[PDB]
Amino acid sequence: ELDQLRQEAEQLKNQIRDARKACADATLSQITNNIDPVGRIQMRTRRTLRGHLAKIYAMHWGTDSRLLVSASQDGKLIIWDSYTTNKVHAIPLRSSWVMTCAYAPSGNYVACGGLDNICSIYNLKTREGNVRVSRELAGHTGYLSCCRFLDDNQIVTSSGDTTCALWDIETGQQTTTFTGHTGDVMSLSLAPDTRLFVSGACDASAKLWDVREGMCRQTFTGHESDINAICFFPNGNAFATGSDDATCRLFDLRADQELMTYSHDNIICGITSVSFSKSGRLLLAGYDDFNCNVWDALKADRAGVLAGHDNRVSCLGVTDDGMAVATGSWDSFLKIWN
Amino acid sequence: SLIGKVTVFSVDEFSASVLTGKLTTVFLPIVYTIVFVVGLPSNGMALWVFLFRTKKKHPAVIYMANLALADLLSVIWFPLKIAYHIHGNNWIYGEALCNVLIGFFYGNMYCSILFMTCLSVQRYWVIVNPKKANIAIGISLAIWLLILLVTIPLYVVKQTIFIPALNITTCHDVLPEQLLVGDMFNYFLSLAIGVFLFPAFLTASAYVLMIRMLRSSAMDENSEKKRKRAIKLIVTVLAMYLICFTPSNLLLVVHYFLIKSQGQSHVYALYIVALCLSTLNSCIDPFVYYFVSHDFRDHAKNA
Amino acid sequence: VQLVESGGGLVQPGGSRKLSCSASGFAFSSFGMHWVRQAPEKGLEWVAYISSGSGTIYYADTVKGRFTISRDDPKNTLFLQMTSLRSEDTAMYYCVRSIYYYGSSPFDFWGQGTTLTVSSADIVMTQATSSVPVTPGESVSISCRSSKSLLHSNGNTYLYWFLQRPGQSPQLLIYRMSNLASGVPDRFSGSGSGTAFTLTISRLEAEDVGVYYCMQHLEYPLTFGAGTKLEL
Amino acid sequence: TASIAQARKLVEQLKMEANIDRIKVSKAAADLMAYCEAHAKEDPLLTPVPASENPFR
Amino acid sequence: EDKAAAERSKEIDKCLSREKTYVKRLVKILLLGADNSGKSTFLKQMRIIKGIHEYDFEIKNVPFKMVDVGGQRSERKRWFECFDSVTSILFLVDSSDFNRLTESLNDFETIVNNRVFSNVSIILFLNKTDLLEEKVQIVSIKDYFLEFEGDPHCLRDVQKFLVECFRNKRRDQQQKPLYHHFTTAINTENARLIFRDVKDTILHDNLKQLMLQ
């Protein structure tokens, strides 16, 4: 009976809530009340990178910590050498409304996507000397929101028709599809060992997915509005979520609960990006307040402010060797901080 | 500008009345005090807003900031001049300050007139046809530099004269005759005609044509409630400009035309009253150019 | 990729000539070009360099003011015009491709060259030996020496290694002292330090016989070495 | 029978999520702080480096 | 030395500048309609040239780009409103089928009152204007709309009623205006009408830049 199934679902939800409420024997706010505060952290601009003609929506650090890629509404991707402020390649597009970009871990390919429902893969190492399109993946019914690489052969995408998928580049079709959300998905992030990943999807909920089986193992809830950014901790055992009601949160995957909430009484705007530092002590956030804030990750206070922009901060990133933080805003400029 | 004679140096009866009378001793201080008080803070505030509260360097901001600077530097030294008129045309502060006043007064007025002409041309150019900021900086520097090369001759000729019969030393109200027919004649008539009439024609032409094109029956009805307002903010500016300045320069010309030909100087009182009229623009300009707007006023009040 | 040159032959003293090179199979407008020369039975020497956008032009000492270089992009052709030739110009000429961006591989394709017959702050390089007898199946090592340190402040070292089989144009083996070019079997290696350089071949085979060359690219003019020949 | 299928899928997902081991929050917090401490000396943004090893200046 | 790489960058920069002079002269129009709103015939008759479609053309030496969204406008989230650079919004609406009007009418109130579109213009095209001529002498508007206060056989009265109904749902009456027109198969003066409305909007902006307001 449908009523029997619904009652069983209610009983299962009660059991799950009771199990979660059983294990909260303390809190991080009390166990870490004896750590010397970090003190004021001030950073200055080291470079400014000019050359775009419109808003900037994405950026990604290459794996050597020196080259980076960016995508704007002009219809262009640009590859920058960060040490000396040059340009390596300028790639035109077939579609002007773009919303994501990625850099392959080996340094050969890049990816691009947007409102055309198609994900394009470009090849940079060629005999003839130019940059030519290598693959076009189609099969989603909505727009793409984020895309990441696993190797030079497999790619993972998330689309705005409530689904995520894993594509095989050599052949050109789907291998596994993940379904289970109600609204559209906005961001996903990959595990350090490339065995799991997480997604946030405008239901005030986030999910953990396995890549070799195709099933979800855990669903977290707690926010009040949309989720716009997500990232892992360097360990691989915690992740930080950013929402649209001026609030960040830190969740754990083994206790299956929520650990910290970062919020302040002077902040009444949304969040556009979240990233971590190498040792796991700092958390960075970009706001619509035209600035970036720097939080301590174990005390929940404020450490500092980076305030060099005159418009919304849309993109944020930290290197793999931990030397610089890069920001991109709707004023058509990127900046590097150290 | 009254002529003096040959050092024994003496003046006639009419001048003896004018310098010792009521027009030059009581009337002027009221006017100059009002102009000082209203003028200084307002143009200062405009300068601060235009320099520190503008995000987009639209050329109108550049030109209006320069005009505000011009009026501000025009108004400041007036305490010494008002001290002069309250002492009874006597002076105690060395020739350098006399030189400074006479140069700065004229330099500042003509800076004001030049930047008004520039603003008119910019408005017509933008409306008629739907880099300018760079050219604005270039033209600002050009005009300033030109002015600095035509304000010099006022310092290099002694501006103060002694008169025993009154036992009074005066600053630029009395001068020796042999200078009036020579260099000063060329300098003043050149300032009167060269730097007033041609820009006046340019401004009049630009505004009249702009009106003719905004009033035509060849554009959409839905804009009407705006366009007519835009008419009333041109007519009130243009008609002010010609009635505040023109009654000065014309009389000046007439004045000298009786010195280079006849040798009487009985039209000085008319020049004094016209100069009173032409000094009020440093106060009446920010109320008709700046404050009648919805954006500048809000930025200034929130600044 | 394919480059074919033409315009050579025989001339009497005096006179003047012109050489052209035609390109196919790549983006000619994005590359720089070099003209390289070889004596009848001796080492290599460098003749001219023309760059992208036709903005920078470099000539050598025994060339300057007597030769001219030019390019035409829409027709994809490269020209060298020569005036008042002498006896020491009898030689065979090669055209070489180049590019410069972070991570690139300069000198990655060589033409097939033409024959022409006619009836000091420079950095010097020294090749150790003129010949080395070798045995199939055994490893070999060669070395060359320089007159300055090639380790610039930014961590790079600019030394190059080329190979020439009997009867064809050379092909690149090693660039920047530690890197392998595309198409080279994974048995060649190189190493060294400031002012000493060595190259190593493990497990020789057939078709590995020829003459080996080491190049510098720290500042113009570029200088070559005498060459080592392995006799199989 | 669409509602039955949806309810059954939801029930199966809840059942699969139900049978998972858990640990206390204190152990997780201790582990997180230990990792954060043990790598403190290698973090250039938290602990700045001398100007000789800064590649950007 | 390999500082020649710097030269490469310079060349790239130059090309970007040769696009900038063009980008500032482009005008964008966002087109919205319906299944029976005659979008296909309207696009076909202008002699122009699966996700978002674009069309690029020119009128009297001014470049126009028209963006067509093919039914995806059901997306109701903020991040799909990334069209904050357009200059006008163009509705096509069918005035023949009375029953559907409310449907189409509903859509209006959702897309016009949004906050990203506070400083853009609206152009309205009521279509066919001959099926109305046929129906008005046959069928009564009052069976569907009860507020028609005139005589339901005169075309002028009913047209005034329709345009009033559409105007009534735009709040904030005056930032930039709402235009309206009637057309069946003109296919020839449409460019002129769109051009006039865009030029009027540009004047609305210029009179604010010069502080003459």
**Identity (one letter) of the amino acid at E115?**
R
DSSP state of C157: B
DSSP state of B26: I
Helix (H/G/I), strand (E/B), else coil: B223:
helix
C32·E4 Cβ contact <8 A: yes
Report resolution in angstroms: 3.2
Tracing tokens 């689904």 back to the chain, one arrives at A163
In whole angstroms, give the CA distance from residue E196 to residue B218.
Answer: 10
Helix (H/G/I), strand (E/B), else coil: B91:
coil
A14 half-sphere exposure, CB direction, 13 A CA radius: 6
On chain A, the residues whose CB falls within 8 A of the CB of E12 are 87, 90
* Subunits close to B (at least 3 CB pairs below 8 A): E
In whole angstroms, give the CA distance from residue E121 to residue B68.
Answer: 36
Task: Please state whether at least 3 CB pairs lie below 8 Å between chains C and B.
Answer: no
In whole angstroms, give the CA distance from residue A258 to residue A219.
Answer: 12
A129·C99 Cβ contact <8 A: yes
CATH number of the CATH domain containing D11: 4.10.260.10
Beta bridge partners of A60: A69
- C131-133 and C2-6 beta bridge pairing: unpaired
Burial A250-267 (b: 16+ CB within 10 A, else e): bbbbbbbbbbbebeeeeb
Q: For residue B147, what is the enclosing H or E element? A: helix B132-148
Kindly give the interhelix angle for B59-75 and B281-289, rounded to the nearest 10 degrees. Answer: 160
In whole angstroms, give the CA distance from residue E192 to residue E194.
Answer: 6
Provide φ and ψ at C56, rounded to 5°. -125, 130
Q: Please report the beta strands in chain C, taking only residues with DSSP state E, as ranges in sequence order.
A: 2-6, 9-11, 16-24, 32-38, 44-50, 57-59, 67-72, 77-83, 91-98, 114-118, 125-127, 131-133, 140-146, 159-164, 171-175, 179-180, 188-193, 196-201, 211-216, 228-231
- Is C1 in CB contact (< 8 Å) with chain A? yes
On chain A, the residues whose CB falls within 8 A of the CB of C25 are 128
Question: Among C3, C53, C63, which Cα is nearest to C31's?
Answer: C53
Q: Do A231 and A240 meet the contact criterion of CB atoms below 8 Å apart?
A: yes
Q: Which option is the CATH number for A2-337: 2.40.110.10, 3.30.300.30, 2.130.10.10, 2.40.37.10?
A: 2.130.10.10
**Identity (one letter) of the amino acid at E87?**
T
Query: DSSP per residue over B266-302, as a string?
Result: TTHHHHHHHHHHHHTHHHHHHHHHTSSSSHHHHHHHH
Q: Which two tokens stand for residue B286?
A: 């920010």
In whole angstroms, give the CA distance from residue A101 to residue A149.
Answer: 10
Q: Do A5 and D11 meet the contact criterion of CB atoms below 8 Å apart?
A: yes
In chain A, where are the structural domains located?
2-337
A116·E19 Cβ contact <8 A: no
Tracing tokens 């530690």 back to the chain, one arrives at C178
In whole angstroms, give the CA distance from residue E9 to residue A209.
Answer: 43
Angstrom CA distances, A86 to A64, B80, D33, E11, stand at 16, 60, 41, 11
Class of the E1-210 domain? alpha beta
Tracing tokens 């035109």 back to the chain, one arrives at A92
Specify the domain boundaries for CATH 2.60.40.10 within chain C.
2-118, 125-230
The range of the structural domain enclosing residue D19 comes to 4-56
In whole angstroms, give the CA distance from residue E183 to residue E125.
Answer: 7
Query: How close C24 gets to chain A, by Cα (Å)?
Result: 10
Task: Please state whether at least 3 CB pairs lie below 8 Å between chains E and B.
Answer: yes
End-to-end CA distance of chain E: 59
DSSP state of C222: P
Q: Tell me how the structure was determined.
A: cryo-EM
Fold (topology level) of C125-230: Immunoglobulin-like (2.60.40)
In whole angstroms, give the CA distance from residue C97 to residue C113.
Answer: 13
Question: Among E166, E161, E160, which Cα is nearest to E108's?
Answer: E166
In whole angstroms, give the CA distance from residue E176 to residue E173.
Answer: 8
Angstrom CA distances, B244 to A126, B37, C68, stand at 75, 19, 72
Helix (H/G/I), strand (E/B), else coil: B180:
helix
Helix (H/G/I), strand (E/B), else coil: B202:
helix
| Mutation for A interface: D12, D46, D49, most A CBs within 10 A | D46
Helix (H/G/I), strand (E/B), else coil: B169:
strand
In whole angstroms, give the CA distance from residue E38 to residue E183.
Answer: 11
Provide φ and ψ at C147, rounded to 5°. -105, 10
Q: For residue C68, what is the enclosing H or E element? A: strand C67-72
On chain E, the residues whose CB falls within 8 A of the CB of B295 are 208, 211
CA A179 to centroid of chain Cα atoms: 20
Q: What is the CA radius of gyration of chain B?
A: 22
E7·C52 Cβ contact <8 A: yes
Q: Where are the alpha helices (DSSP H) in chain C?
A: none
- C114-118 and C77-83 beta bridge pairing: unpaired
A236 half-sphere exposure, CB direction, 13 A CA radius: 7
Q: Is A36 exposed, middle or buried (0-12, 13-18, 19+ CB in 10 A)?
A: exposed
Return all residues near A43 (Cβ < 8 A) that are at least 6 apart. A304, A306, A325, A337, A338, D45
Provide φ and ψ at E22, rounded to 5°. -80, -40
- The yes/no answer on whether domain C2-118 falls in CATH 2.60.40.10 is yes
Kindly give the interhelix angle for B295-302 and B28-52, rounded to the nearest 10 degrees. Answer: 90
Helix (H/G/I), strand (E/B), else coil: E59:
strand
In whole angstroms, give the CA distance from residue C208 to residue C203.
Answer: 10
On chain E, the residues whose CB falls within 8 A of the CB of A115 are 51-52
Beta bridge partners of B160: B171
Q: Do A244 and A254 meet the contact criterion of CB atoms below 8 Å apart?
A: no
How many separate domains does chain D show? 1
Return all residues near E188 (Cβ < 8 A) that are at least 6 apart. none
End-to-end CA distance of chain A: 62
Ramachandran area for residue B115 (φ above 0: left; ψ -120 to 50: alpha; else beta): alpha
Question: Among A228, A202, A225, which Cα is nearest to A288's?
Answer: A228
Q: Which two tokens stand for residue E117?
A: 């579109």
Query: DSSP per residue over E127-170, as a string?
Result: E-SSHHHHHHTTS-GGGT-S---S-TT-HHHHHHHHHHHHHTT-
CATH number of the CATH domain containing B207: 1.20.1070.10
Q: Do E115 and E81 meet the contact criterion of CB atoms below 8 Å apart?
A: no
Question: Among B10, B132, B30, B147, which Cα is nearest to B86's?
Answer: B30
Q: What is the dihedral of CA A138, A142, A145, A149, to 10 degrees?
A: -20
Neighbour count for residue D20 (Cβ, 10 Å):
12
Query: How close C86 gets to chain A, by Cα (Å)?
Result: 38
In whole angstroms, give the CA distance from residue E161 to residue E150.
Answer: 9
Q: Do A88 and A79 meet the contact criterion of CB atoms below 8 Å apart?
A: yes
In whole angstroms, give the CA distance from residue B73 to residue B83.
Answer: 19
How many separate domains does chain B show? 1
Q: Is A10 exposed, middle or buried (0-12, 13-18, 19+ CB in 10 A)?
A: exposed
In whole angstroms, give the CA distance from residue B290 to residue E212.
Answer: 10
DSSP state of C53: G
| Mutation for E interface: C29, C100, C102, C175, most E CBs within 10 A | C100
Q: Do A105 and A65 meet the contact criterion of CB atoms below 8 Å apart?
A: no
